[PDB]
Symmetry: D2
Subunit: 314 residues, 4 copies
């Protein structure tokens, strides 16, 4: 048995770029848009529906309510708030946790028993929050984690070596935020280790690697400073996560998942790690052999998230 | 010989929804984004590029300048301005005509010799302006016209009769604006005339038709009033027009084209009519047998646009 | 709830062209191949599986047994036999009916409760046979009927008027065989009636229509005489029927369906008529207004099939 | 500038499975089929054309002659002969070399200046022959090499570890034939080296690797013995090679290429190696660090092909 219904909670540019990308890719049959501003969600459903006669797939799209979650295979949460003038980061963190809690309680009230995908920032902490408040098994609750950071990394590398970015197999791990890091010890192009690529190609050197990490680190800021917000990138990352689940792919993607003893960092954190996705959610987390530097960086990143969660009394 | 490069002029939500939809559909290989705010166009190119590692097609995407138009197969113009406090409609009409003129002169300076597609509103008058200022043959300059209105119509009909909207073959003709009208005399579902569908199906009646026309008429307003602007719909319409040209389809779509004696309304207006699109642009305009009411409505619509153009001293 | 499993019974070139086309289009997730020659089905599954690492969709493909039908959403039957030296047409007709009966009993034994799609020839009579032997409701048993004849017709017309064949909306109706006929009274290009197209375009005349009918009539023979058998065409027709069902499209396609009083020809025959397909099978048969000639031709075609069925004591 | 025309020479099941797969994937716009049996090629073009009204892309498909190669971007050669009763392997090798020579001379006579892709067996020797007889630069002449063997390898590995085969990044190198070998030293799943996968997963062990190599070695025989010939697998491999070129991907695929000093085996052989493909053909061969065993195996494989070529007085 298979499901083909996704509910999107929050119709800001992240949720709607995701929805539009799904419409253009024909990812699923049925889409339901939820927003605290019901009129806005209705307008967004009109605007999506009006392009369908030109789209690749027959779809059913509507604005709905939490009761529409009941038989949804996936709910994607993008809701949250922005820092107010004078507001501390812990205060805001707590306001976003309360929003996620409320969304998740409303989703669970419907009878929903599918998978939760959190894209709201800070995504690692909010995925943990959603996991705890949902009562669901952690293999059924994920966050988008470093999937977009990873796509950025592949893009940047591809510009040095002029190889299809889809042939670049390297991950950003850890917190989706300032403490993320590149796993260079397990990076290849095609089947070829990155260290060998560096030795072979004049196009890419050791110095470029640190530059690329910085570019990946600064990418969100850079986009926000130029066009107010970033959303096309995450929209396609969320589509890809969705497709791995509905197409039952057993695809390896870096996403926010509960470590739970897989890596030797903090067990009780959601954090960006490569994981196998299929129709049932997370099949398992892939355990990479990290070098000493990367393991240290993963520990640092996990400690940071665990402190955040402690401070939110989670 | 084939081209696979599109330039988008103006990176507001219409131009960028179009670009993102192309990225998700893999419509063409190469995309160049132009905007008077160069930093903004650069941010938009970053945000699109970051989703490519998850996209269906290898692409080259960058922010560029008018010189990048030189070997573009298609330039899509979305630039323009909004009414200022106190501004007359003729004043604003003239300010938009001057913007189009300037864009088009800059495009032609590059050596460009491809096709122009105008999506800026009011699209029928601005397509005529672009045609005149470009010096190009009118088969190489088009506007998006009533292609989106037509998709809306198909969507609305599909909701009554519960048939795939892509099986609904009916057009909105005329001005993309208040004087557009439904061509009911040439409308079918599958191969079946709409009048026969009405007789057969309890699901749809003569009264529903006038309602559907009103819904189509009010659709933009409705969306704008709920989410500030409409853009997902036109984005997919522009993709479809683009695909008909780059895939050399000889596809019939209702778009803004120079009447030029095909219908018996004003010859010297661009107006929404069904037309055959292929790699060379407009192969010919399809001439439908209109009934007396529709012919009158087309004349009214053409007269309105011709008066607009006169008033702009075109 | 949605299904994504198809079983193919008979792995000759029709069944396997269908399967390969599905693999290349990514139509469904799961495919099971059945053949009385188990080793052959296993070889075909190997050969399909080996292309998947290059395919657009993750799939599960295997050779199986009738018990694999139990949770299949669709079983496509292509099994049957060829005329032996000296064999009468009624004898062979009866040998094919017994094969279909046996296949269908074996399918039903599994607990299967999905949709049956018969492609074996003569498809209209064998669809009726499959319907009767299955015990299923007639909306859940169909044949491929004149869907391919219809694609041929659209192709031929497109070559005269140089319009995308997918914009040509015209049907072949009746028996998939010598008594099929073109429904010219309900034929259009885009939204434009074919009679108007003829008047407008020097490219197509009344004389061409009879020629086109003859071409469509002779197409199978022509292909068989040049490459031994026809199978790429039907393979893509079967994919399209499958996609209408699994994508729940409410798509109108001409297929073999039980008339049952919809048209005024024989009620108890399966015959090629336009029908609405969705995830539940046939939603309804579309009733076209036929002209006097076409109605007569449909009656002739139905009488022929009814005589065939009588002669088989169905 | 971009091309979108492919010519297929030889319409047996390899050439036609390739063509049909392209039609179902919409790989290119224009297809021309050539065969010494012109009637057969015409029948194959009919059978393909008849499915287009149901296909994803508008296409132009016809049977043609060598003059149609003139503006083709790619010619795919599948022509050749089978061993006769009593015939030595060197005799037959020479008969196939003469066929390739004749095809290639006829292609070059047209004015063709695109890329040659040889799929005829033995593909490595015949790619060299085509290269020499064509007068073209070796970056513009390739063979399908071990691309299919590689897809088989990925499929087999995926069945042990239950990961999307498209996440399995490992190559078969060398002769497409008995002396091919797995490059285990440069094999990963996602970004994770295969040795680490073996250590982590109970699902796959060192012993399985030798078994998998044997399965890959025996795959063609196995399929041939069950269904007479193998062709669906190579058909999709050829599509993938084609797509890398027409979509200008800079994609890494293992194909037959002229070693020419890249690896330290024989310089003057075509042999299966990973290579970067884009619109211009082979950008460069990727040089992997091979371990001692693999380097020896590559040398053995190259020596075998060089002896074959010597024996054919190439
Ligand atoms: Cl569903
Ligand atoms: Cl939001
Ligand atoms: Cl291009
Ligand atoms: Cl703008
Ligand atoms: Cl399923
Ligand atoms: Cl069979
Ligand atoms: Cl071309
Ligand atoms: Cl051949
Ligand atoms: Na280097
Ligand atoms: Na009615
Ligand atoms: Na005519
Ligand atoms: Na193991």
């Amino acid at each position: 048995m298979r499901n083909s219904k996704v509910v999107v909670v929050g119709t800001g540019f992240v949720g709607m770029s995701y929805a539009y990308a799904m419409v253009n890719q024909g990812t699923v049959e049925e889409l339901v848009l939820l927003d605290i501003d019901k009129r806005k969600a209705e307008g967004e459903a009109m605007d999506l529906n009006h392009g369908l006669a030109f789209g690749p797939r027959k779809m059913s799209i509507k604005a709905g309510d939490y009761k529409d979650c009941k038989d949804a295979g996936l709910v994607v949460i993008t809701a949250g708030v922005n820092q107010k003038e004078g507001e501390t980061r812990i205060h805001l963190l707590k306001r976003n946790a309360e929003i996620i809690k409320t969304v998740v309680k409303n989703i669970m009230s419907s009878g929903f028993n599918g998978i939760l995908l959190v894209a709201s920032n800070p995504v690692d902490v909010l995925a943990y929050v959603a996991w705890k408040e949902s009562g669901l098994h952690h293999s059924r609750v994920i966050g988008s984690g470093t999937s977009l950071d990873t796509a950025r990394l592949r893009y940047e590398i591809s510009q040095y070596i002029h190889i299809d970015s889809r042939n670049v197999h390297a991950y950003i791990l850890g917190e989706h935020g300032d403490s993320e890091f590149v796993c260079w010890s397990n990076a290849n192009v095609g089947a070829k280790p990155i260290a060998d690529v560096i030795d072979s190609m004049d196009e890419i050197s050791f110095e470029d690697l640190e530059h690329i990490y910085l570019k990946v680190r600064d990418a969100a800021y850079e986009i926000i400073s130029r066009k107010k917000a970033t959303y096309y990138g995450i929209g396609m990352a969320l589509v890809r996560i969705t497709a791995a689940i509905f197409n039952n792919e057993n695809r390896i993607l870096p996403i926010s998942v509960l470590n739970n003893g897989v890596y030797d960092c903090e067990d009780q954190v959601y954090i960006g790690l490569p994981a196998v996705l299929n129709k049932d959610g997370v099949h398992h987390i892939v355990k990479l052999k990290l070098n000493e530097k990367e393991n240290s960086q993963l520990n640092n990143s996990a400690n940071i998230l665990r402190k955040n969660l402690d401070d939110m009394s989670y």
